[PDB]
Amino acid sequence: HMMLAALKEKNAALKEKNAALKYKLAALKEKLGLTPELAALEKELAATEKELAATEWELAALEADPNPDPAKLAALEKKTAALEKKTAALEYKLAAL
Numbered sequence: 001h002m003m004l005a006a007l008k009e010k011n012a013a014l015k016e017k018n019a020a021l022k023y024k025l026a027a028l029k030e031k032l033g034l035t036p037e038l039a040a041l042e043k044e045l046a047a048t049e050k051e052l053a054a055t056e057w058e059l060a061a062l063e064a065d066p067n068p069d070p071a072k073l074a075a076l077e078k079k080t081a082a083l084e085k086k087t088a089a090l091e092y093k094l095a096a097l
Contacts, residue, residue, distance in 0.1 A: 003073055004062055011056060017022050017087050018049050024094050032097065041093055046085050055079055 011060055058076050062068040064079060 003077070004059070004068065007073075007076055007080055008059055008063075010084065011052070011059060014052055014080070014083055014087060017054060017091070018045065019083070021045055021094060028094065028097050035037070037093075041090060044086075044090055048083060048090065051079075051083060055083070058069060 022045065025038065025042055029042075032038065055076060058072065062073060062076065
């Protein structure tokens with residue numbers, strides 16, 4: 001439960017970051033036009049968003065489980081860390097524009 005509570009908080013921060021990146025992306029599209037780089041970053045943001053939605057389903061099932069599988073919890077933890085790195089990389093690509 002302790003490790004699952006932290007994963008829920010990390011997921012919450014990731015959804016908030018993804019939303020703000022959406023508004024930054026759209027703002028950059030206005031300032032610079034639809035450049036091929038922005039189109040690539042939008043495609044990467046849309047993908048990352050879909051993986052974030054999928055892992056929230058895993059959080060919910062693990063929360064409902066009276067004895068949550070440590071293996072599934074560890075799989076979610078590594079997936080959350082990968083998405084945190086992917087989102088931070090996308091944030092840097094956007095800030096560089």
